[PDB]
Design a binder for this molecule. Structure first.
Ligand SMILES: Nc1nc2c(ncn2[C@@H]2O[C@H](CO)[C@@H](O)[C@H]2OP(=O)(O)O)c(=O)[nH]1
Length: 104
């Protein structure tokens, strides 16, 4: 059930897969939504040890279960690459500044 824990947000594999599919599709069509223009390149400044190759893209995953459509993105993100492989699930919760910590 709780495959990914972001602070207090709990996401299942299906939740991630659904959000990732939506984000990858917009990337594929070259579209973006929200004040921060998601999905956009994630440079991995935090230096996370991803098992998949770059480039990476961040896309918001909502605790409500809805697919992001340009509103408030919240603190959690799913990270994917050009192969639509899941690099990881990250969050701003528990981090300082605009930094991310990996969800466990
Ligand atoms: N913290 C962080 N921000 C990133 C990274 N890659 C791109 N960014 C963007 O770099 C700027 C400083 O963090 C922000 O615009 C941020 O976008 P988001 O705010 O949409 O994450 C990354 O690897 N880590």
């Amino acid at each position: 059930a709780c495959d990914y824990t972001c602070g207090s947000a709990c996401y299942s594999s299906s939740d991630v897969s659904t959000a990732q599919a939506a984000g990858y599709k917009l990337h594929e069509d070259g579209e973006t939504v929200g004040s921060n223009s998601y999905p956009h390149k994630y440079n991995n400044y935090e230096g996370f040890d991803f098992s998949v190759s770059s480039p990476y893209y961040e896309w918001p995953i909502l605790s409500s279960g809805d697919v992001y459509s340009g509103g408030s993105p919240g603190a959690d993100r799913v990270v994917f690459n050009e192969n639509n492989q899941l690099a990881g699930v990250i969050t701003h919760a528990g981090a300082s500044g605009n930094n991310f910590v990996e969800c466990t």
